Amino acid sequence: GSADYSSLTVVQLKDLLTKRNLSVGGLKNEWVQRLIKDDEESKGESEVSPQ
Numbered sequence: 202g203s204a205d206y207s208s209l210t211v212v213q214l215k216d217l218l219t220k221r222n223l224s225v226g227g228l229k230n231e232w233v234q235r236l237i238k239d240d241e242e243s244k245g246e247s248e249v250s251p252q
């Protein structure tokens with residue numbers, strides 16, 4: 202995996218979270234999950250659109 206927020210901090214996780222526009226209304230574990238999903242949305246190639 203490219204992301205390892207699971208080790209990061211709740212402050213950095215939620216900070217970067219809002220930075221992505223996703224959110225933080227969840228939790229650290231859920232933050233790393235949503236983040237990992239956020240970065241994975243590009244699969245290391247290119248982002249996508251909600252269509």
